[PDB]
Amino acid sequence: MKRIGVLTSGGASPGMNAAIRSVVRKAIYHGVEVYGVYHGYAGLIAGNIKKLEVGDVGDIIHRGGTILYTARCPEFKTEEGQKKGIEQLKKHGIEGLVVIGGDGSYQGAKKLTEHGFPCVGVPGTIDNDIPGTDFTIGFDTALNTVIDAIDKIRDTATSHERTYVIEVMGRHAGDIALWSGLAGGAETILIPEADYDMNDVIARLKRGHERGKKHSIIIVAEGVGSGVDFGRQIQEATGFETRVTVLGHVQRGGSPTAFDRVLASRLGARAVELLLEGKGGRCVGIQNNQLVDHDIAEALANKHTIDQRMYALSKELSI
Template identity: 60%
Template sequence: SARCPEFKEKEVRQKGIENLRKRGIEGLVVIGGDGSYRGAQRISEECKEIQTIGIPGTIDNDINGTDFTIGFDTALNTIIESVDKIRDTASSHARTFIIEVMGRDCGDLALWSGLAVGAETIILPETETDIKDIAEKIQHGIDRGKKHSIIIVAEGCMTGDMCASELTKYINVDARVSVLGHIQRGGSPTGADRVLASRLGGYAVELLLNGETAKGVGIKDNRLVATNFDEIFNTSERQINQRMLGLTEELSI
């Protein structure tokens, strides 16, 4: 895991394995992302008597083997609530607001929140961005009488300040930046996240009782699935939902 790089060392992993043995732990459920999964896989390889199952937990929704990760819906709703409030002041003061959300390599938070709040433009790390095209779109809205605009930008693509600086080179707008930051990582879980966590947790225990190991649980088409760690690691990167992206363009016209 990125939060415990020492675990990449075999000696450190052996200490962890010994601690599990001392406590009589035969099954380990790891909640996290790619790094946590890799650590769990190493444990299952180096200590056959300890079973490991991974549960996807990250707000970025960037883990293979599942449609949704625990935390994504909660962060999404936090963004929506924040942007709804920002839109009030954007409207009353006739401003263009650029809202930077989390998502270093995966733009799901930006995409889903942008669609939910009716953003005029969404900037994602998975797609090429031409600020001039965005400026023309914003200007077209102004020409039609639009008084304000909302732009959602994923942090992995560019910073909100960078976007504002580039945008104002092409059009004369009062562009303000709001970086939501770590507010996206906190708060009470939504109902959807609570239900998802309960379903995945129950399924993880079921797999352990059935003797399964070195697998990550997930939800696909609302069905519980289990995928080997190797398959999760070797699957190509998740693709952005092009239909949703196209829909945001249609609705923002």
């Protein structure tokens, strides 16, 4: 091809800009034009398309968010919506599309590929639950955002006020919670992929206080429930003064870490490789520390899993 497109969909994820830059620079390296599609599939339908020159991706590698923005598009979840998008692409001479985002963005890539239009998905989300990849672009940064709060809370502990609950992001996936929990020394970590007994949790807390543990940190995935509630719940059971922090959308913002920028650079470039090799209808990723790509439809068929051993370890280390 002579001309490709690029968009971002889903919530913002640190590293999207690193991925947009990789896509533009890799394409341009092979003499291919790249056109930016703004506001995701909404902007595609609306015709928000503009050429991205080599310098237009300068000074964005280190920047959070996305210069192409992100928007919801229930219209594109329909055939009338998909139809107008293909029209806008044909109109601007765009022969393939790189889509960067979450579970949502991949369905649109699937549907465009079903309608014969070459499209490759790039995993851009903080929650780590996109198939075809061990890690999504944004996950590493979000974990470092979480542990920055955990580390500050460790300075604020007292003998009376020593129990803390932190509510982290992750729709449906416990990856942020598990990994940030391990990295932050959390005693208890509540995730959708592992059963928890609140009595087992209360016992742990009392055993730790009894042996002189300065403080206890409990991490709660938003997909298990509310931390504000687990906080109230733990107080009146144990009598222990419990402070709850709800981190929220700070977890999607910030400059990406080194790994997120590298992952983004490598996966963006691979998305372009696939489109130029005439291999649309795929998604890219890293698996077992190797770059990979898969059919989107097959990849999406896979259920998300977490490392149960890591969950067990985190319990062991926090005695």
